[PDB]
Homo-oligomer: A and B are copies of this chain.
Amino acid sequence: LATPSPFDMEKMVWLDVNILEIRKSVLENFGVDWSKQIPGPFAAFGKDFV
């Protein structure tokens, strides 16, 4: 004839979460940048034999 409870009281849990992030960066760009491809010498010939 016994009856159950509507529900069972459960233990409660507390959760503590930490998330830590650090970012660092360095950027340098220095010097003299020259041309690396330049025109070369040229030669040409032309004649009319007849």
A residues sitting closer than 8 Å to B (CB atoms) are 29, 32-34, 36, 40
Of the A-B pairs whose beta carbons lie under 8 Å apart in the complex, a sample of 4, sorted by A's number, is: A29-B36, A32-B40, A33-B40, A34-B40
Question: For residue A29, which residues in chain B have a CB less than 8 angstroms away from its CB?
Answer: 36
CB distance from A5 to the nearest CB of B (A): 15
The number of times this chain is found in the oligomer is 2
CB distance from A9 to the nearest CB of B (A): 15
User: What is the bound-complex CA distance between A7 and B37, given in angstroms?
Assistant: 73
CB distance from A46 to the nearest CB of B (A): 10
User: What is the bound-complex CA distance between A29 and B24, given in angstroms?
Assistant: 19
User: What is the bound-complex CA distance between A32 and B37, given in angstroms?
Assistant: 10
